[PDB]
């Protein structure tokens, strides 16, 4: 099988700059590598065929290159609408194969997360549940680490973390962190805290409430 190794899977680039995506095949290809762009909601769309031919309506800023074992997609200069997943693909022998994909994101200025914490609603409590929720909104870059504390003690059991993709509006990220407890345990502790570590802060960013 012609294995396609695509790197990096994740790449950030400032507007005006040059994005380069590499795709190395385990054995040699044409003239048979293609590239696909996949925007968030949509199906993949053919971008490059052959190795360097643009498809209908593909901006000249997109250029593919390479031969034999080694291919590339370069977009120069990157614009705001270039945010997408990019996939290389060989059409030369069955099994047709794809690279793992690259998520292209806009690099922008660091932004500290804005944090909100929410006690379980009375409606969940009355049903026996007790989820505590922390929103960590509009930050950059995307790497962030969230810890939950209960009465000052760390708790990683029952923690659900979820990141949005890059926001089209301001190129920031947001993430949600949920500590799932039962009401019986929730009622037995006083204070709940989510703490996050991020580039924009030397100390943990903290948000807390006392149950009442």
């Amino acid at each position: 099988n012609i294995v396609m190794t695509q790197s990096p899977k994740s790449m950030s680039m400032s507007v005006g700059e040059r994005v380069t995506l590499t795709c190395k095949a385990s054995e040699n290809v044409g003239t048979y590598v293609s590239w696909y762009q996949q925007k968030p909601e949509q199906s993949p769309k053919l971008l490059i065929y052959g190795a360097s031919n643009r498809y209908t309506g593909v901006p000249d800023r997109f250029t593919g290159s390479g031969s034999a074992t080694d291919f590339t997609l370069t977009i120069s200069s990157v614009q705001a609408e270039d945010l997408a997943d990019y996939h290389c693909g060989q059409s030369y022998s069955t099994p047709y194969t794809f690279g793992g994909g690259t998520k292209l994101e806009i690099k922008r200025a660091d932004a500290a997360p804005t944090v909100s914490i929410f006690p379980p609603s009375s409606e969940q409590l009355t049903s026996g549940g007790a989820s505590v929720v922390c929103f960590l909104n509009n930050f950059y870059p995307k790497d962030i680490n969230v810890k939950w504390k209960i009465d000052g003690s760390e708790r990683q059991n029952g923690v659900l973390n979820s990141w949005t993709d890059q926001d089209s509006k301001d190129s920031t990220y947001s993430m949600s962190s949920t500590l799932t407890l039962t009401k019986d345990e929730y009622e037995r502790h006083n204070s709940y805290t989510c703490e996050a570590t991020h580039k924009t802060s030397t100390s943990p960013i903290v948000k807390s409430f006392n149950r009442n």
């Binding site: 949509q42 199906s43 794809f98 929410f118």
Partner: protein
């Protein structure tokens, strides 16, 4: 122009079977080979199957051989994928694609994708909980808990509230999915003008609206 439309996705138990369809229009269907390609939740594209224009040459990916069959009905301009002996790992978005772009053969046109989830978990509507909290701005939230299968869709004030809404991708815990959504509104006008999160769950035809009430 070229049009490809799919259907037949849904939830199936492991070992189960299902059949996807791909309707074609705006080209001579019987003159093109067609592909199925899939894309899992995490993820990446994966080639599934190929069938030549006249259904004579068929090819399969290793992981589907002997379980999946690809076929077509040229008079009805329709491409099919018959899936049997379903595994968890077959969970994916399934696309059909035309083998066009002659003589530089390429998947030039793709369907919209139809979602297949393979799981022994059953279809369940979510519970939906309002998350209430100076700022000028105030952030409110919506917790959507314990539904299956994916997806759910989230709106606030029925689409009227757009910017500042973040809807987080679902996470699986204890067999079911949970997600949350946040919205930011003016502090001077809340709660005096109402904020509602609306949640709908396609698989169970469930729709829920939830006003966000204040609390100290």
């Amino acid at each position: 122009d070229v049009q490809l439309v799919e259907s037949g996705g849904g939830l199936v138990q492991p070992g189960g079977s299902r059949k996807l369809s791909c309707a074609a229009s705006g080209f001579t269907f019987s003159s093109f080979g067609m592909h199925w390609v899939r894309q899992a939740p995490e993820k990446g594209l994966e080639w599934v199957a190929y069938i030549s224009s006249g259904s004579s040459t068929l090819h399969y990916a290793d992981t589907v051989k002997g379980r999946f069959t690809i076929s077509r009905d040229n008079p009805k301009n329709t491409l099919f994928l018959q899936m049997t002996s379903l595994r968890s790992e077959d969970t994916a978005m399934y696309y059909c694609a035309r083998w066009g772009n002659y003589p530089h053969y390429a998947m030039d046109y793709w369907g919209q994708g139809t979602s297949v989830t393979v799981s022994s978990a059953k279809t369940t509507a979510p519970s939906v909980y309002p998350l209430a909290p100076t700022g000028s701005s105030v952030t409110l939230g919506c917790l959507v808990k314990g539904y299956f299968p994916e997806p759910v869709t989230l709106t606030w004030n029925s689409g009227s509230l757009s910017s500042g809404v973040h809807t987080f991708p679902a996470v699986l815990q204890s067999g079911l999915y949970t997600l949350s959504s946040s919205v930011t509104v003016t502090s001077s006008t809340w709660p005096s003008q109402t904020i509602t999160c609306n949640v709908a769950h396609p698989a169970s035809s469930t729709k829920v609206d939830k006003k966000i009430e204040p609390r100290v």
